[PDB]
């Protein structure tokens, strides 16, 4: 099943996966380390953010097709969002200066 | 102007107060149904200006104005929004207390100088412990009960300080005073210092001055208000699919909302003992419940969801937050295929269908339209993308050719696993892939998944055009040799092609070069013919950029003719470039890409695949009755075998042979006779096949498919086909051992029934384990690149001087690696070869020219002093210089790369990915060369290194010292093979004889120590104590371990004497006959038994020092990897000088050492467990071990040095991997044991860290500036303890790293309270916060931007 | 279509940052506002970009010089 964009979850911004006719299937912590082993810094760090964790990484992509800028927020990943979250849940709360 | 890193700080009503500034503020939005929330604003209609209850025409009497607006329906004046900043309301004011105290460690108990358990108790309890005051003698953390709180404040009155509850808790963490506890347990710890003071005081001393520097303040671990999330950034994922049941979450939200809410209103409103007391002990427990302790009194116990144990499952969900972020997400723009093989077309390029076309390329196509102009809007082209026109097609072609696709196989191992090619359109649902491609991905066309991305604009399509292509990546950065598999059809197809045939049709011919085409394509002449006179055109490339051509009349076979039209370069012309048709062809293919790994060398290289697969179909090998041969010796080795056993079991029946020696017998016999049966098989293998051309005598080579297979090398092996024939083996699953009844049956023979049973036995037990070896590979994986992230390689070259002495392995019979490949691409400080008369220069790069011209000529010097990666002078990084220069690319690598990090985590995966055999290969043989017959491997004179010689009186050579040296240097002076030679080998021939290839000088039995004597006469036992020490009869000397401690000092030797009583000294020897017993050993003969020359005495039957066998593969790799020290150690020398054992130990550790005379002596004792290989009438100087077995890596390293644990540990690695197969260069290797070595503990003073060891970099930079200042006694050297080397991603400097890796509760905890800055130093911790990694690509604006850091 | 990077490697040897300079100039070429120098083989501007760097009139002082020759004359 070939997937492009679909429908996220409220939880970390990530979807569901697959047979919902959505998600790019995944590239797990192997595949981290297989773009830590190619030494490609772009495609892992615009990888764990661009897509997911960051919105400002798909709106400006999609606006950059448009005449074709190729330019890729890096953006701050919501997912780590979320963990700043969860820690702010938690009973030490750490915040950005 | 942009950000850097976050800031770790604690929870404060300021911030919290200003996350809020509504305190808590309605439902918001919800309860439709309700119809109206909470409803206290300004408005045009508010009927209430001028005060709170009053109209504005004056009239708020009566039915007017008040609490009755200009509309009295729904829709509340109370929103609050949903998203933008995170939200706080009340949630639980009073106390928190929570992550502190939650880690081991209690740091309120550390600050407050109280327990765990007894801060647990008296959280939620009456406290009442009194606050400084002036005019009370009690201390500031003074604990008082209840009535002494009441005796108290009634008896001080005024000025006493004092609160109700967790306030005297509040209040102690807000009267701690940081500054007088800094200097007043500074002075009274500098002022009285004790080994248990140093613990729990001097750290305590800098932890509170990492308190008082820190700048946060304790005041504000407890929290006045809690922030509380916005759902989106709160989302919790439930495990039914979002319920939230019985959890303890709702058991502390019915408890805490109830009891929180009448708390709060409590006390605002002022509430007396009863009320106060119910909601402050029902509040309490509801803020300190969830923190820690209480019942799990949840609903019913059993058949309910309880997701609550420690409140850890919001930062953890599984193993942490790896689900969450810093691990793999959904990604985007996947086909996930199923892989096909292209055969055709080019080696990196993709058979990407039209179906997975156009699906993922519909931005390129609006875009493309809109460009190009073909449609009008954005719209109307998703309307021409939606009708499937024929014109997007073109268009489509045009984006597809040059637009790249990356690959990747999901079970992802190493960097080449994800690789760049061309698209093309294929018709079909699968995606033809490259085979020569897909052994580098290591997929199989079994079925398994494919993931497939779409790259994105510049650096993705650009990188990988640029980095990642298959032809651009060719080396592979673990056995370092250019990793390419042109197996199967390739191997059997150009050995097929290159081969002679004696007669058959064609004889000679003159024709030469075009000689293919009209001579195979036309008639009358052979694929291949023998005797050939067809010349063949050569070319020199010796010339300075230029080709120097050549030609001559060479005997060739019309294939290998065919396959020199492939390489139009220069090559041996038919020599190395044709041979068999063998692996020699992926050997002619290295020596091919040895020059200029670019170019034609790299284009058309894939015309041995296409004449491969084209004439391998040609040839049209098959497989079938005819092919297989059974030998007729194998009914005769069969009935023979069987008769040999019936007569075994009738002796056995008789009771003449033991079970044990008959089983093991039998087993031996029929090895043995299967061995047999597979070189009678081999025979009928290939002089079996004839053919029948004129008289037929002369026969020809075998045409037969499997002796292709097995010659060529395209699959198969003399195992399986020795199963396909011959005998099967025999192997047992459940016992372990081999069992009795043999198979044999071949497979073309009808298999017996027990004979399937115990191969479908053996056979899922392999299943198991080739099951299980995956998740251990991985688990390997996952430690090991934990461990490798910290390598920036920042510095080019920083000219260090350190670098290892390179010598070659020379282990066993015959040496498993030559020194030019250890010695090959790496730096070199001096590595001058031959007897020093010039060779190399100290300012000279090792090429491949340089270096094969230093190995090829004078080769009598194999030890070159060569720059390692572990030595580097560099602070921050690693030098690329002194690493070496090696890539997946060509050479002179550049900064910014992972390098052996990512390569070696990478190159061990595929090591342990499969066991060898049982896995007790890898495990220790218990059998080797010089353990059974020493051998020597080159003619020539063979001496001992290290050792003592001593001549004995039966013309016999022993070694006077335990570790000695034996080595066969030829006439050159290169060391061919050189083993240890142990004390006690009695040799023919000490030294001054030679020796020639396969040479035993010395032969000891490993299951029984000789002890071979001297002097003859009657034995007597030394220092042997009864019943203490030392317990047909025979005595047992056991180690010094489980004898008494008394008598412990004095070790159990075997001291012959003579008729008259004197003592006989050996000839040439100061010390008389006598032999030295290790622990556990048994000793047959007891006292008053006359013994001859050369009578043995006690036996080992177990190693005792470093006794337990091997680990095993998986065992060695993961304690190798986990680098731990040994469990029993041995000794060391630390220092020179005069060596010797002495006096006696009495109830304590045995072995009190003589020596350290000289500078300052210090007592040595020990448990003495092996045995001594020190001499105690010799000085001893430094690094010599004194005693055998594992050096353990903390004494190895402070002892045997940085260049022998290098040494170990390559070679174990290389021994293990090398039996295995794989073949691992030293670099990367050398780069763990980098990785490895640092965080090196430190015992400098005067630089402040004192007593406690830290990084070597911050060892580096303090003694810089150290020896920079005026000041150069500061510094002080370091020890080179590794410790586990596991913990190392615990040790890293960075914050928000290795949170994932580890535990994010503890980690949370521990460094929370440190509050050190996570600065993005580090990498994951870069690929978590989202900035780009400051290495690879993103090197040079890392560089360059954070260059700027200095000015702020 | 270009066999190897290692003849610009040969030009300049870098490789690191090579990915920055060849995605500039196809970054020229591609937004638009610039000119293909090789004759084409059906190649988009990318691998043009590429030969570009082969050809050995393209590099960093090259985008220098060019790029603030093009602000300053904009």
């Given at each position: 099943?070939?997937?492009?964009?679909?429908?996220?979850?409220?939880?970390?911004?990530?979807?569901?996966?697959?047979?919902?006719?959505?998600?790019?299937?995944?590239?797990?912590?192997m595949?981290?380390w297989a773009?830590e082993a190619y030494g490609?810094?772009?495609?892992?760090?615009?990888?764990?953010?661009?897509?997911?964790?960051?919105?400002?990484?798909?709106?400006?992509?999609?606006?950059?097709?448009?005449?074709?800028?190729?330019?890729?927020?890096?953006?701050?990943?919501?997912?780590?969002?979320?963990?700043?979250?969860?820690?702010?849940?938690?009973?030490?709360?750490?915040?950005?200066? | 102007?942009?950000?850097?890193?976050?800031?770790?700080?604690?929870?404060?009503?300021?911030?919290?107060?200003?996350?809020?500034?509504?305190?808590?503020?309605?439902?918001?939005?919800?309860?439709?149904?309700?119809?109206?929330?909470?409803?206290?604003?300004?408005?045009?209609?508010?009927?209430?200006?001028?005060?709170?209850?009053?109209?504005?025409?004056?009239?708020?009497?009566?039915?007017?104005?008040?609490?009755?607006?200009?509309?009295?329906?729904?829709?509340?004046?109370?929103?609050?929004?949903?998203?933008?900043?995170?939200?706080?309301?009340?949630?639980?004011?009073?106390?928190?207390?929570?992550?502190?105290?939650?880690?081991?460690?209690?740091?309120?108990?550390?600050?407050?100088?109280?327990?765990?358990?007894?801060?647990?108790?008296?959280?939620?309890?009456?406290?009442?412990?009194?606050?400084?005051?002036?005019?009370?003698?009690?201390?500031?953390?003074?604990?008082?009960?209840?009535?002494?709180?009441?005796?108290?404040?009634?008896?001080?009155?005024?000025?006493?300080?004092?609160?109700?509850?967790?306030?005297?808790?509040?209040?102690?963490?807000?009267?701690?005073?940081?500054?007088?506890?800094?200097?007043?347990?500074?002075?009274?710890?500098?002022?009285?210092?004790?080994?248990?003071?140093?613990?729990?005081?001097?750290?305590?001393?800098?932890?509170?001055?990492?308190?008082?520097?820190?700048?946060?303040?304790?005041?504000?671990?407890?929290?006045?208000?809690?922030?509380?999330?916005?759902?989106?950034?709160?989302?919790?994922?439930?495990?039914?699919?979002?319920?939230?049941?019985?959890?303890?979450?709702?058991?502390?939200?019915?408890?805490?909302?109830?009891?929180?809410?009448?708390?709060?209103?409590?006390?605002?409103?002022?509430?007396?003992?009863?009320?106060?007391?119910?909601?402050?002990?029902?509040?309490?427990?509801?803020?300190?419940?969830?923190?820690?302790?209480?019942?799990?009194?949840?609903?019913?116990?059993?058949?309910?969801?309880?997701?609550?144990?420690?409140?850890?499952?919001?930062?953890?969900?599984?193993?942490?937050?790896?689900?969450?972020?810093?691990?793999?997400?959904?990604?985007?723009?996947?086909?996930?295929?199923?892989?096909?093989?292209?055969?055709?077309?080019?080696?990196?390029?993709?058979?990407?269908?039209?179906?997975?076309?156009?699906?993922?390329?519909?931005?390129?196509?609006?875009?493309?339209?809109?460009?190009?102009?073909?449609?009008?809007?954005?719209?109307?082209?998703?309307?021409?993308?939606?009708?499937?026109?024929?014109?997007?097609?073109?268009?489509?072609?045009?984006?597809?050719?040059?637009?790249?696709?990356?690959?990747?196989?999901?079970?992802?191992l190493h960097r080449l696993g994800?690789?760049?090619?061309?698209?093309?359109?294929?018709?079909?649902?699968?995606?033809?892939?490259?085979?020569?491609?897909?052994?580098?991905?290591?997929?199989?066309?079994?079925?398994?998944?494919?993931?497939?991305?779409?790259?994105?604009?510049?650096?993705?399509?650009?990188?990988?055009?640029?980095?990642?292509?298959?032809?651009?990546?060719?080396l592979s950065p673990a056995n370092g040799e250019?990793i390419?598999?042109?197996?199967?059809?390739?191997?059997?197809?150009?050995?097929?092609?290159?081969?002679?045939?004696?007669?058959?049709?064609?004889?000679?011919?003159?024709?030469?070069?075009?000689?293919?085409?009209?001579?195979?394509?036309?008639?009358?002449?052979?694929?291949?013919?023998?005797?050939?006179?067809?010349?063949?055109?050569?070319?020199?490339?010796?010339?300075?950029?230029?080709?120097?051509?050549?030609?001559?009349?060479?005997?060739?076979?019309?294939?290998?003719?065919?396959?020199?039209?492939?390489?139009?370069?220069?090559?041996?012309?038919?020599?190395?470039?044709?041979?068999?048709?063998?692996?020699?062809?992926?050997?002619?293919?290295?020596?091919?890409?040895?020059?200029?790994?670019?170019?034609?060398?790299?284009?058309?290289?894939?015309?041995?695949?296409?004449?491969?697969?084209?004439?391998?179909?040609?040839?049209?090998?098959?497989?079938?009755?005819?092919?297989?041969?059974?030998?007729?010796?194998?009914?005769?080795?069969?009935?023979?075998?069987?008769?040999?056993?019936?007569?075994?079991?009738?002796?056995?029946?008789?009771?003449?042979?033991?079970?044990?020696?008959?089983?093991?017998?039998?087993?031996?016999?029929?090895?043995?006779?299967?061995?047999?049966?597979?070189?009678?098989?081999?025979?009928?293998?290939?002089?079996?096949?004839?053919?029948?051309?004129?008289?037929?005598?002369?026969?020809?080579?075998?045409?037969?498919?499997?002796?292709?297979?097995?010659?060529?090398?395209?699959?198969?092996?003399?195992?399986?086909?020795?199963?396909?024939?011959?005998?099967?083996?025999?192997?047992?699953?459940?016992?372990?051992?081999?069992?009795?009844?043999?198979?044999?049956?071949?497979?073309?023979?009808?298999?017996?029934?027990?004979?399937?049973?115990?191969?479908?036995?053996?056979?899922?037990?392999?299943?198991?384990?080739?099951?299980?070896?995956?998740?251990?590979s991985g688990?390997l994986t996952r430690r090991l690149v934990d461990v490798a992230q910290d390598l920036v390689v920042?510095?080019?070259?920083?000219?260090?001087?350190?670098?290892?002495?390179?010598?070659?392995?020379?282990?066993?019979?015959?040496?498993?690696?030559?020194?030019?490949?250890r010695?090959?691409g790496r730096?070199?400080?001096?590595?001058?070869?031959?007897?020093?008369?010039?060779?190399?220069?100290?300012?000279?790069?090792?090429?491949?020219?340089?270096?094969?011209?230093?190995?090829?000529?004078?080769?009598?010097?194999?030890?070159?002093?060569?720059?390692s990666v572990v030595?580097c002078?560099?602070?921050?990084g690693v030098?690329a210089?002194?690493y070496g220069?090696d890539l997946a690319?060509?050479?002179?690598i550049?900064?910014?790369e992972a390098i052996g990090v990512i390569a070696a985590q990478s190159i061990g995966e595929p090591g342990t990915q499969?066991?060898?055999?049982?896995?007790?290969?890898?495990?220790?043989?218990?059998?080797?060369?010089?353990?059974?017959?020493?051998?020597?491997?080159?003619?020539?004179?063979?001496?001992?290194?290290?050792?003592?010689?001593?001549?004995?009186?039966?013309?016999?050579?022993?070694?006077?010292?335990?570790?000695?040296?034996?080595?066969?240097?030829?006439?050159?002076?290169?060391?061919?093979?050189?083993?240890?030679?142990?004390?006690?080998?009695?040799?023919?021939?000490?030294?001054?004889?030679?020796?020639?290839?396969?040479?035993?000088?010395?032969?000891?039995?490993?299951?029984?120590?000789?002890?071979?004597?001297?002097?003859?006469?009657?034995?007597?036992?030394?220092?042997?104590?009864?019943?203490?020490?030392?317990?047909?009869?025979?005595?047992?000397?056991?180690?010094?371990?489980?004898?008494?401690?008394?008598?412990?000092?004095?070790?159990?030797?075997?001291?012959?004497?003579?008729?008259?009583?004197?003592?006989?000294?050996?000839?040439?020897?100061?010390?008389?006959?006598?032999?030295?017993?290790?622990?556990?050993?048994?000793?047959?003969?007891?006292?008053?038994?006359?013994?001859?020359?050369?009578?043995?005495?006690?036996?080992?039957?177990?190693?005792?020092?470093?006794?337990?066998?091997?680990?095993?593969?998986?065992?060695?790799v993961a304690?190798l990897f986990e680098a731990?020290?040994?469990?029993?150690?041995?000794?060391?020398?630390?220092?020179?000088?005069?060596?010797?054992?002495?006096?006696?130990?009495?109830?304590?550790?045995?072995?009190?050492?003589?020596?350290?005379?000289?500078?300052?002596?210090?007592?040595?004792?020990?448990?003495?467990?092996?045995?001594?290989?020190?001499?105690?009438?010799?000085?001893?100087?430094?690094?010599?071990?004194?005693?055998?077995?594992?050096?353990?890596?903390?004494?190895?390293?402070?002892?045997?040095?940085?260049?022998?644990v290098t040494?170990?540990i390559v070679?174990e690695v290389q021994?293990v991997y090398?039996?295995q197969?794989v073949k691992i260069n030293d670099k990367h290797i050398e780069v763990i044991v980098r990785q490895m070595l640092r965080?090196?503990?430190?015992?400098?003073?005067?630089?402040?860290?004192?007593?406690?060891?830290?990084?070597?970099?911050?060892?580096?930079?303090?003694?810089?500036?150290?020896?920079?200042?005026?000041?150069?006694?500061?510094?002080?050297?370091?020890?080179?303890?590794?410790?586990?080397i596991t913990?190392a991603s615990?040790?890293?400097?960075?914050?928000?790293?290795?949170?994932?890796?580890?535990?994010?509760?503890?980690?949370?905890?521990?460094?929370?309270?440190?509050?050190?800055?996570?600065?993005?130093?580090?990498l994951?911790?870069?690929?978590?916060?989202?900035?780009?990694?400051?290495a690879?690509?993103?090197?040079?604006?890392?560089?360059?931007?954070?260059?700027?850091?200095?000015?702020? | 279509?270009?066999?190897?990077?290692?003849?610009?490697?040969?030009?300049?040897?870098?490789?690191?940052?090579?990915?920055?300079?060849?995605?500039?100039?196809?970054?020229?070429?591609?937004?638009?506002?610039?000119?293909?120098?090789?004759?084409?083989?059906?190649?988009?501007?990318?691998?043009?970009?590429?030969?570009?760097?082969?050809?050995?009139?393209?590099?960093?002082?090259?985008?220098?010089?060019?790029?603030?020759?093009?602000?300053?004359?904009?």
């Open positions: 099943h070939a997937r492009s964009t679909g429908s996220y979850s409220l939880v970390t911004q990530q979807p569901l996966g697959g047979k919902a006719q959505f998600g790019g299937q995944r590239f797990g912590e595949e981290v773009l490609a810094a772009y495609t892992l760090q615009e990888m764990l953010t661009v897509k997911s964790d960051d919105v400002n990484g798909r709106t400006k992509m999609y606006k950059n097709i448009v005449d074709g800028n190729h330019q890729m927020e890096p953006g701050m990943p919501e997912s780590f969002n979320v963990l700043l979250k969860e820690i702010r849940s938690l009973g030490i709360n750490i915040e950005l200066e | 102007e942009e950000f850097d890193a976050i800031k770790i700080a604690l929870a404060s009503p300021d911030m919290i107060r200003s996350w809020s500034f509504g305190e808590v503020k309605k439902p918001e939005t919800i309860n439709y149904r309700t119809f109206k929330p909470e409803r206290d604003x300004x408005x045009x209609x508010x009927x209430x200006x001028x005060x709170x209850x009053x109209x504005x025409x004056x009239x708020x009497x009566x039915x007017x104005x008040x609490x009755x607006x200009x509309x009295x329906x729904x829709x509340x004046x109370x929103x609050x929004x949903x998203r933008e900043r995170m939200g706080h309301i009340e949630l639980a004011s009073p106390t928190a207390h929570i992550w502190f105290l939650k880690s081991l460690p209690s740091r309120i108990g550390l600050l407050l100088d109280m327990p765990l358990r007894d801060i647990e108790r008296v959280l939620y309890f009456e406290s009442y412990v009194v606050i400084e005051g002036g005019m009370t003698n009690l201390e500031r953390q003074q604990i008082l009960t209840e009535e002494q709180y009441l005796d108290a404040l009634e008896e001080f009155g005024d000025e006493f300080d004092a609160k109700m509850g967790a306030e005297a808790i509040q209040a102690l963490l807000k009267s701690m005073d940081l500054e007088q506890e800094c200097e007043q347990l500074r002075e009274e710890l500098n002022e009285t210092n004790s080994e248990t003071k140093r613990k729990k005081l001097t750290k305590r001393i800098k932890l509170l001055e990492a308190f008082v520097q820190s700048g946060n303040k304790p005041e504000w671990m407890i929290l006045t208000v809690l922030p509380v999330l916005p759902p989106d950034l709160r989302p919790l994922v439930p495990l039914d699919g979002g319920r939230f049941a019985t959890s303890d979450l709702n058991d502390l939200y019915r408890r805490v909302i109830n009891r929180n809410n009448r708390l709060k209103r409590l006390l605002d409103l002022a509430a007396p003992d009863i009320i106060v007391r119910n909601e402050k002990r029902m509040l309490q427990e509801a803020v300190d419940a969830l923190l820690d302790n209480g019942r799990r009194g949840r609903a019913i116990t059993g058949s309910n969801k309880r997701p609550l144990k420690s409140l850890a499952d919001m930062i953890k969900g599984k193993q942490g937050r790896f689900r969450q972020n810093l691990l793999g997400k959904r990604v985007d723009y996947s086909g996930r295929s199923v892989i096909t093989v292209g055969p055709y077309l080019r080696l990196h390029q993709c058979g990407l269908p039209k179906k997975m076309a156009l699906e993922l390329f519909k931005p390129f196509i609006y875009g493309k339209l809109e460009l190009r102009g073909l449609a009008t809007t954005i719209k109307a082209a998703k309307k021409m993308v939606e009708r499937e026109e024929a014109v997007v097609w073109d268009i489509l072609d045009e984006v597809i050719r040059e637009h790249p696709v990356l690959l990747n196989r999901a079970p992802t994800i690789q760049a090619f061309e698209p093309v359109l294929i018709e079909g649902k699968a995606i033809q892939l490259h085979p020569l491609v897909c052994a580098a991905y290591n997929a199989d066309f079994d079925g398994d998944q494919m993931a497939v991305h779409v790259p994105l604009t510049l650096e993705a399509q650009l990188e990988a055009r640029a980095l990642m292509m298959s032809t651009n990546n060719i250019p390419i598999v042109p197996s199967q059809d390739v191997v059997l197809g150009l050995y097929y092609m290159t081969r002679d045939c004696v007669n058959a049709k064609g004889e000679g011919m003159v024709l030469t070069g075009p000689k293919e085409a009209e001579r195979l394509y036309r008639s009358g002449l052979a694929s291949l013919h023998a005797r050939v006179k067809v010349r063949i055109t050569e070319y020199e490339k010796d010339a300075n950029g230029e080709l120097v051509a050549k030609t001559s009349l060479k005997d060739t076979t019309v294939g290998r003719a065919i396959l020199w039209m492939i390489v139009p370069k220069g090559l041996p012309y038919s020599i190395v470039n044709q041979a068999l048709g063998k692996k020699a062809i992926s050997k002619m293919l290295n020596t091919c890409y040895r020059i200029l790994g670019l170019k034609p060398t790299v284009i058309f290289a894939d015309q041995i695949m296409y004449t491969g697969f084209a004439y391998a179909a040609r040839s049209g090998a098959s497989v079938g009755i005819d092919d297989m041969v059974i030998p007729e010796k194998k009914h005769e080795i069969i009935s023979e075998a069987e008769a040999e056993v019936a007569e075994i079991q009738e002796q056995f029946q008789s009771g003449l042979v033991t079970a044990g020696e008959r089983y093991n017998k039998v087993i031996d016999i029929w090895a043995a006779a299967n061995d047999r049966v597979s070189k009678a098989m081999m025979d009928n293998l290939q002089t079996e096949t004839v053919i029948n051309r004129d008289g037929q005598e002369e026969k020809q080579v075998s045409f037969n498919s499997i002796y292709m297979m097995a010659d060529s090398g395209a699959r198969g092996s003399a195992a399986q086909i020795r199963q396909l024939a011959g005998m099967r083996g025999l192997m047992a699953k459940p016992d372990g051992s081999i069992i009795e009844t043999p198979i044999t049956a071949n497979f073309r023979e009808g298999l017996n029934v027990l004979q399937y049973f115990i191969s479908t036995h053996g056979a899922r037990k392999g299943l198991a384990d080739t099951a299980l070896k995956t998740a251990n688990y920042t510095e080019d070259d920083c000219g260090t001087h350190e670098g290892i002495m390179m010598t070659p392995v020379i282990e066993g019979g015959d040496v498993k690696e030559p020194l030019r490949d010695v090959l730096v070199t400080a001096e590595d001058v070869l031959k007897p020093g008369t010039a060779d190399i220069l100290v300012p000279r790069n090792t090429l491949l020219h340089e270096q094969w011209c230093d190995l090829l000529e004078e080769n009598s010097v194999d030890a070159v002093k060569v720059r030595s002078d560099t602070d921050f030098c210089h002194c220069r690319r060509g050479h002179i550049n900064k910014g499969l066991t060898m055999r049982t896995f007790h290969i890898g495990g220790a043989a218990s059998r080797a060369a010089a353990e059974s017959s020493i051998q020597v491997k080159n003619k020539g004179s063979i001496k001992l290194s290290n050792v003592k010689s001593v001549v004995n009186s039966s013309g016999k050579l022993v070694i006077t010292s335990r570790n000695t040296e034996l080595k066969l240097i030829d006439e050159f002076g290169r060391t061919k093979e050189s083993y240890k030679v142990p004390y006690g080998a009695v040799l023919a021939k000490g030294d001054g004889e030679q020796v020639a290839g396969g040479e035993t000088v010395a032969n000891w039995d490993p299951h029984t120590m000789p002890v071979i004597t001297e002097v003859s006469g009657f034995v007597r036992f030394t220092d042997m104590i009864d019943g203490q020490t030392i317990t047909l009869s025979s005595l047992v000397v056991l180690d010094s371990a489980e004898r008494t401690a008394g008598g412990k000092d004095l070790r159990p030797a075997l001291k012959i004497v003579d008729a008259q009583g004197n003592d006989v000294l050996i000839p040439g020897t100061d010390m008389p006959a006598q032999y030295f017993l290790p622990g556990k050993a048994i000793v047959q003969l007891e006292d008053g038994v006359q013994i001859s020359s050369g009578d043995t005495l006690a036996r080992i039957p177990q190693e005792s020092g470093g006794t337990k066998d091997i680990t095993g593969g998986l065992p060695r304690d731990r020290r040994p469990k029993e150690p041995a000794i060391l020398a630390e220092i020179s000088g005069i060596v010797s054992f002495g006096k006696e130990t009495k109830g304590k550790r045995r072995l009190v050492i003589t020596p350290v005379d000289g500078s300052d002596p210090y007592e040595e004792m020990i448990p003495k467990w092996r045995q001594l290989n020190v001499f105690e009438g010799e000085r001893v100087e430094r690094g010599d071990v004194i005693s055998d077995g594992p050096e353990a890596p903390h004494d190895i390293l402070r002892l045997r040095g940085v260049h022998a040494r170990y070679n021994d090398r039996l197969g965080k090196a503990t430190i015992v400098n003073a005067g630089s402040s860290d004192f007593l406690e060891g830290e990084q070597v970099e911050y060892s580096r930079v303090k003694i810089a500036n150290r020896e920079l200042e005026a000041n150069g006694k500061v510094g002080a050297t370091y020890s080179r303890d590794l410790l586990g913990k615990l040790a890293t400097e960075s914050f928000i790293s290795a949170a994932s890796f580890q535990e994010t509760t503890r980690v949370l905890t521990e460094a929370a309270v440190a509050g050190k800055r996570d600065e993005l130093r580090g994951k911790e870069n690929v978590i916060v989202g900035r780009l990694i400051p690879g690509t993103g090197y040079a604006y890392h560089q360059d931007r954070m260059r700027r850091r200095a000015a702020g | 279509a270009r066999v190897t990077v290692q003849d610009a490697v040969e030009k300049i040897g870098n490789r690191f940052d090579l990915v920055l300079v060849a995605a500039r100039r196809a970054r020229q070429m591609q937004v638009g506002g610039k000119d293909p120098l090789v004759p084409e083989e059906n190649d988009k501007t990318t691998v043009i970009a590429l030969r570009e760097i082969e050809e050995g009139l393209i590099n960093n002082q090259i985008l220098d010089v060019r790029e603030r020759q093009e602000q300053q004359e904009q």
